[PDB]
Design a protein around this ligand. Sequence first.
Ligand SMILES: [Mg+2]
Length: 218
Amino acid sequence: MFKAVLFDLDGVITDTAEYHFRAWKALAEEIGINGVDRQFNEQLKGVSREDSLQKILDLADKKVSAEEFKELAKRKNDNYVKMIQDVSPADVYPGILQLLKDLRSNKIKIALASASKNGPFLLERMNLTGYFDAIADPAEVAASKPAPDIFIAAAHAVGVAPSESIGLEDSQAGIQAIKDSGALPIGVGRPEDLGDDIVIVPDTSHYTLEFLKEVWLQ
Ligand SMILES: [Mg+2]
């Protein structure tokens, strides 16, 4: 049986999509760029901060120096961090808390493998820190998803090989990263984004210990 489960944060444990959206909107409003509405924000989901900022500047063909770019990116982040002060246990996705409890009572290691620079803060706000055996520090890994580095680091941090682990993710790049780490992916979402070759559940309420055991056996 698997010895560890490696969790991404966003799209598995929770999301902060409304807060990122409000941050970018607020920034666009500040600088007088029209177009940054909910529909447009779909093009920013899971995209890097710098790429998201450039997409917004492009709406107005707007040209900016390195330092100005840096400052607008900082401004959006400051926005975002202020807004996530309201994250709470109610932000935990369906099924995850019970999964965590069951994993822990069966002595299965639990690790975070998230690019989020606010991972530990977010886990504290959701009251989930006591379940985590480790949090892979995204600042200490050479390469980001779909590179496997973060999943390797996470499994190693809890004393296991990735081949002993299940990885849970909602993105194609995450699922690839899990695959190449040597852990077993189980995706949440749809095959059109994630691929046909891995097990997928429609939502996180399907992530149960019983189900992860059935996948591992199979
Ligand atoms: Mg994710």
